Amino acid sequence: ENTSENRAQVAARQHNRKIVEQYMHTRGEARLKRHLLFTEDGVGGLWTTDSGQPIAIRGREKLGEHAVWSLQCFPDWVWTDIQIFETQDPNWFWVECRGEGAIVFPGYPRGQYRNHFLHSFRFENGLIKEQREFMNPCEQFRSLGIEVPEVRRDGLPS
Amino acid sequence: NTSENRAQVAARQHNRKIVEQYMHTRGEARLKRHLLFTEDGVGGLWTTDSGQPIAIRGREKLGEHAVWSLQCFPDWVWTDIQIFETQDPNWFWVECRGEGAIVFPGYPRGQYRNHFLHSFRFENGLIKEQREFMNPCEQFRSLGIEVPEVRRDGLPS
Numbered sequence A: 001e002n003t004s005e006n007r008a009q010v011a012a013r014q015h016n017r018k019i020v021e022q023y024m025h026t027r028g029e030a031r032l033k034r035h036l037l038f039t040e041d042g043v044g045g046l047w048t049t050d051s052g053q054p055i056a057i058r059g060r061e062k063l064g065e066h067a068v069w070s071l072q073c074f075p076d077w078v079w080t081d082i083q084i085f086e087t088q089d090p091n092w093f094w095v096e097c098r099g100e101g102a103i104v105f106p107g108y109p110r111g112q113y114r115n116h117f118l119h120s121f122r123f124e125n126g127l128i129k130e131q132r133e134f135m136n137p138c139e140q141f142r143s144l145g146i147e148v149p150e151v152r153r154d155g156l157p158s
Numbered sequence B: 001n002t003s004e005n006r007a008q009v010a011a012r013q014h015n016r017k018i019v020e021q022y023m024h025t026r027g028e029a030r031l032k033r034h035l036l037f038t039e040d041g042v043g044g045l046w047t048t049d050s051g052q053p054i055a056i057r058g059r060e061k062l063g064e065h066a067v068w069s070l071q072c073f074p075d076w077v078w079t080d081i082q083i084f085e086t087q088d089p090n091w092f093w094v095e096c097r098g099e100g101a102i103v104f105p106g107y108p109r110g111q112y113r114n115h116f117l118h119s120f121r122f123e124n125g126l127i128k129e130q131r132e133f134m135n136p137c138e139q140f141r142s143l144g145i146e147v148p149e150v151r152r153d154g155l156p157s
């Protein structure tokens, strides 16, 4: 039904989608201003780590400061194969994508990193309140020359 | 309010019920979870230490796989289940937790807990493709496997 309230939900979803698109296409020195897409208290970061705990970057300013490090350590990064999923919540989206680029972490050799990613984006007032990255840390270990632990699944049917 | 749209709404509602039922399947009922899939339906684990998915292809293979899964994760429960519909009536995402004993050949019995994302795509009201995404490091830990620590030298606080 075409009511003011359904219309408002559609408008919000449409706006938020454009910000997801923008986020996912932000490259190069533009990454130094990606933080401006977030609420002042917005959070971003990596939810799949070797320690099992997220690394959460809290606050728009902290995200901007973080961008300096990310641009250093992933100097040519691009997201590819981007699929945006709207949800029943006009303020929540998921993205499935791939990503590739050099990885330049001090203490490791320079390497090439490729992974499969899921990102979660939650909005408030048309800015991102929470972004979260989910990936397979093992592919990052590979890129850094770190030996990947192996699980044997004996008896797993074929 | 158009038949195209009434059809999609119905398909999405039907498919959501199937996602709910999959997520709440426990115990011996797991031996029949494969009945939720198309005959050629695929399920499995998309985040593995090898970097390649472990795909289980076909309804019959998924039922055979259930035997293994019930032995290796004998009391498994999904919890904190959040179901995301999408613009596609035939594609859902689930974010949840899961926990239970892990009992793999050649590793000490453990307690495995993880955070999960599942993707479910549908055809003809049955699951055509289910994919699990988790952090393999938590599964290493549950099996007593040492996990390396990545150092992020510049990383601000």
Ligand SMILES: O=C(O)c1cc(Br)ccc1N[C@H]1CCC[C@@H](C(=O)O)C1
Pocket: A045, A046, A055, A056, A070, A074, A077, A099, A133, A140, B152
């Ligand atoms: O992979 C990490 O070590 C990582 C650590 C924190 Br903490 C946050 C995010 C992380 N993932 C990267 C992957 C490459 C692009 C990059 C970006 O888009 O800023 C983010």
Ligand SMILES: O=C(O)c1cc(Br)ccc1N[C@H]1CCC[C@@H](C(=O)O)C1
Pocket: A153, A156, B044, B045, B054, B055, B069, B073, B076, B132, B139
């Ligand atoms: O974690 C694995 O080793 C794994 C291997 C393949 Br092959 C497929 C799925 C896997 N994940 C489990 C996690 C516990 C519940 C279980 C189930 O719901 O059947 C599936």
